[PDB]
Symmetry: D2
Subunit: 284 residues, 4 copies
C-alpha cells in the first residue's frame, strides 16, 4: 500500500465545488470505516494514520479523508464553523460513494468533525472511535487556551520551523518521536501560502455567531451509538479533564486512557490503538 496506490479525489458541492483528497485501501472488505486526521499545521490522512492504515485495511475498507484545508483537499480562505464545514463535505462524499451508515475514527479536529457529522447526519454514522477529540471535549480543570492550543496559535502568527517544532513537542509524551525529518516534512506542507490561508481561516472559523456548533459537549447525550473515547494521560492540547462530560452523557460511551502518552495516541500507542479500534468496530 502507498500514498499513490491509495490516492483518490472526488468533487462535492459545499457552497460551490470542493475537491476532496482521500486514501482508499482494503477494497475487498465488507465493513467500511472513515479515518479523519488531527488538525495541526501540515497534517494530512496518510502521515497522521501511517502506523494505522495498513493494519486497519487488513480488516476494513478504509477511507482516510484529508479534511478541507489539509493535504491535497481544497484550501478555501473563507468557510463557516470548521467541523460543520468538514462534516458537510464528508456527507457530500458519503452520498457520492453510496455509503449508508458507516463507523468513523477521528483524532483531535477530526474527532470534532466525526462528532459534528454524527449529530448532523445521525443515521449516517455508526460506532465512533475518537482520540483526544476537539468539540465534545470541555476542559473542566485546564485553563483555556491550553499550552498545546497556545503553541498552535503562536505558529499561525509566526510560522517558523522553531514554532512548529515547539508545537509538535507538546503533541507527544516521548519527544524523540519528533525527528528532524518529521519536522521538515510537516513544516514543508504547513508553510505553503495555501496551507497558511487554510490555517488562518480555521482560526477565525471558531470565534463567530455559530460558536454553539463547536460546543458539542452540549449535544453528545443524543448519540445512540457506541463511542470509544481514547486519550493519552499526558495530552497537553485536549487534556484528560476534557473527556468527562462526553463519558458521562454518551449512553454507550467507553473510555481508554494510556499513561505515558500525549495527544497522538494513534502514533505513540499505535499497536494498542489498532487493536482497540479493530475490536471495537467488530473485528471485520
Amino acid at each position: 500500500l502507498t500514498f499513490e496506490s491509495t490516492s483518490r479525489f472526488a468533487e462535492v458541492d459545499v457552497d460551490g465545488p470542493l475537491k476532496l483528497h482521500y486514501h482508499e485501501a482494503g477494497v475487498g472488505n465488507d465493513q467500511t470505516v472513515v479515518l479523519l486526521h488531527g488538525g495541526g499545521p501540515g497534517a494530512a490522512s496518510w502521515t497522521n494514520f501511517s502506523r494505522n492504515i495498513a493494519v486497519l485495511a487488513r480488516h476494513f475498507h478504509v477511507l482516510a479523508v484529508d479534511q478541507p484545508g489539509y493535504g491535497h483537499s481544497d484550501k478555501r480562505a473563507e468557510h463557516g464553523q470548521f467541523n460543520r464545514y468538514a462534516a458537510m463535505a464528508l456527507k457530500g462524499l458519503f452520498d457520492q460513494l453510496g455509503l449508508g451508515r458507516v463507523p468513523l475514527v477521528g483524532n483531535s479536529l477530526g474527532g470534532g468533525t466525526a462528532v459534528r457529522f454524527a449529530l448532523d447526519y445521525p443515521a449516517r454514522a455508526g460506532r465512533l472511535v475518537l482520540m483526544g477529540p476537539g468539540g465534545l471535549s470541555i476542559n473542566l480543570f485546564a485553563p483555556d487556551p491550553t499550552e498545546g492550543v497556545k503553541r498552535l496559535s503562536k505558529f499561525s502568527v509566526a510560522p517558523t520551523r522553531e514554532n512548529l517544532e515547539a508545537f509538535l513537542r507538546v503533541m507527544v509524551y516521548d519527544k524523540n518521536l519528533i525527528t528532524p525529518e518529521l519536522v521538515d516534512q510537516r513544516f514543508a506542507l504547513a508553510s505553503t501560502p495555501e496551507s497558511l490561508t487554510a490555517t488562518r481561516a480555521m482560526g477565525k472559523s471558531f470565534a463567530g455567531a455559530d460558536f454553539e456548533a463547536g460546543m458539542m459537549w452540549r449535544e453528545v447525550y443524543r448519540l445512540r451509538q457506541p463511542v470509544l473515547l481514547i486519550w493519552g494521560r499526558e495530552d497537553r492540547v485536549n487534556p484528560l479533564d476534557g473527556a468527562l462530560v462526553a463519558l458521562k452523557t454518551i449512553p454507550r460511551a467507553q473510555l481508554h486512557v494510556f499513561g505515558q502518552c500525549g495527544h497522538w495516541v494513534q502514533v505513540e500507542k499505535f499497536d494498542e490503538f489498532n487493536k482497540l479500534t479493530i475490536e471495537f468496530l467488530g473485528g471485520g
Copy 2:
C-alpha cells in the same frame, strides 16, 4: 473444566496454619496468572470468575484463589488489616508453588489484595489488572460510605435474603443479572455462621491503628509495572471518581471505563474484559 476438577488446597503459615482453597486450570500454559475475587457476602473464586476462568485458561495457567474468609478457605474470627492478611497468605502460596514474578487480576476487595501484595512483595507481582478495586480507590467526590458500602454494612448487621438482594442489585447496572438462583446460591454461602464470623472480622479489620495499610492510594506511585484499571461507569460501590489518584500516580497505568456497567465488570462486560485481560497480559 469444573469446580471439582479445578479444586485444590494448600496450607500456609499466617500466624499459624491457614487452609487456602484455589482453582487451577490451563496447566499446559507457560504464563501463570492469579485471580482474586470480590469481597461481597458469599463471593468465592469459581462463581466470581465463572464467565472468565474457561476463556483465560485457554491462554494462561490460572490460579483463582479463595481469599481468607471466603469460599472453602479458612474463616478465622480474628486477623489484622484484611488486604495485608490476604496478601501474606497469597505470598505463602507463591513460595509453596515455587512462583517468582506473576501477574495478578483482582476485582474489588481482590484488587485491594493484589495491590497490597504488589507493594509488600514488589518483585513477586507482574502486570496487574484491577476492576473497581478497593484500597487504591479514594472517592474524591462520592461521600463515604457509598450506597454500595452502606448496603454491605446493613447485611452484616441484619443478614437477611432481602438485604443481600438489595446489596447485589447495586453491584450491577442491569438488575436482571440478579436472578432468584444467584441470590439463593450467594445467600446460602453468606449466611453460614463461619461466613458471618469472617464477614464481621473483615469489617472490624479496616478500622484499627493500621488503617494506613488500607490507604494504598498513598503508595501506588511506587508500582513499576503496567497496571490496567477497569471500571464500570455506573459502579455504586467504588465509584469512578475513585480511579483518579491511581491513574495519575501509577507511571504505567491504563484505564478502561465501560458505560452501562456497574461494579461487576468481569460479569456484565465479560467478553470485553476477557479480551482486555488476555491482550494486556501478553496473549499467552
Copy 3:
C-alpha cells in the same frame, strides 16, 4: 418575625390564575433579594429558610417565594418543565410587585428555577447564590439517580413517615438535625392529598419530552452576572461533582465548598452561609 406576620399572597397569570404564597421581611432595606426553597417533600420557604430570613432581613428586603406545587402556592395536577413553569410564575410576581433586576438565592430545585429565570429574563436577575442546585448540576462521576434522588422517588411511590425519614437523613451530614418533630412537621405538609398530586405532577414533568429545558449545564455559559455556587462536600442528592460544568462555564463563577456538610448548607453551616450570601450580594 413569624410565618403569619411575613405571609403574603399574589395572583399571577401562567395558563390562567395562579396563587403564589411568599414571605416578606426587611421592608424598606434598599436591596431586595428573592429566596427559592428546595424540592424535597413538604418543602416551603419558611421551613427551608426560617432562621436565614431573620438574618438576611437585617440587610435585605427578603421575598421568600413558595414555588408552584409547594407550601401555600397553587398545587396544579399538571404543568410543563417545572423550572420554566416556576420561572414564569416568578416573572409574574416580579411584574406585579414592580421589581426590576433582583439577586436570587436558590437551594436545589429553587436554584434551577433561579437559573432558568436568569436565562429566560436576563435583565431581571442580578447576582445568583445557588446551594447544591438542580438543573445546572451534572454529576460527572455519581451514577444517576443518586441515593438522595432514589429516596425522594421512593417516598413519592410510598408516602410513609418512614420513607420521609430515610430521605431527610441523606440531606445532612449530622443525622441528629433530623428530629422526630422535623419528620412530623414535614410528613404533615408532604402527605396532604394536594401536595401528593403536586409531587405526582412533578414526576411526569421531569420525565416527559420537555427535559432539555432542565439541562441548564448546557446553557449557563450565557450567565453574565457573578454566580456563587455553594456546596456541602457530603451532599448525597446533588453531589459535589455536579458543580464542575457550571464552575468552568459561568464566566464570573465562584464556588464555596464546606466540609462536614450535606445538601442543606443553609441549616448545617447556617452562620457561614448567611455571611457568604450577605458579603456576596454586597452587604446590603
Copy 4:
C-alpha cells in the same frame, strides 16, 4: 507601613545559625497570624503580601516571614527537602518569639511550608489558609510539569528578564498586572548571584531522594484544624484539579474558587481574599 518600619530579623538554629527576615505589623492585636509567600523568582513577604498586610494588620498581629532562600533570609547553597527545612526554620522562630499555636496563611511554596509545619508540630499550627498551595496539591488531570512550573525551570536555567516576564504572565488571569516595573523589581531581586544559588539549591532539593516529604497530599488526612483552600480557577502553576485530594481528605476543609483569577489570588481578588481570610481566622 513600610518595608523598613516593619522589617525585623531573628537568628535561629537549623544545622547552624540561620538569619530569618520577617515583617511585623498590628502589634498588640490579640491574634497573631504568620504569612508565608510563594516560591517564584525574587518572591518575598513584602512584595507578595504588601497590600494584604496593611489590611490584615487592622485585625491581626501579622508576621510575614521571608522563607530561607528568599528576600533577606539566609540563601544557603544546599539544604534538605525545602518545606521541612523552611518549617524547622519557622519552628525556631516560633520558639524564639514565644508563639504558642498560631494560624498560618500560605501561597504556593509557603502553603506547602505551612502544611509541613502543621503536620510535624501539630500543637503549634492553628487554622490554615492555603492559596494555590504546593505539596498538598496533586494535579490529577494536568500533565506535570505544568506551564507555570516549566517557565519557572526555564528562568532558572536562563535567568533573563524575558524568561521572568514569561513566568509572571502565567501567574495571573489579567496579564496587565505584569507591569514593566514589576518585571524590573522582581528581575533585580531574582538575578543577584545569592538568589541564583538559592534557586539552584531549590532545584537539587525537589529533585533528590527526600521527595516523599514533598508529597503532603498523602498526609493531610492528619490535619485536625479547619483548613480553607483558596484557588484561582485559571491557576496555570498549581491548577484547580490539585485541590481535590486535600478537599476530600482534610476533615474540616473548605474550598473557595474565584473565576477570572490566576495563581496570585491575594493580588487579583485582593478584597475578597482579605475578607475570606479575616472571617475564617475569626475576625481578630
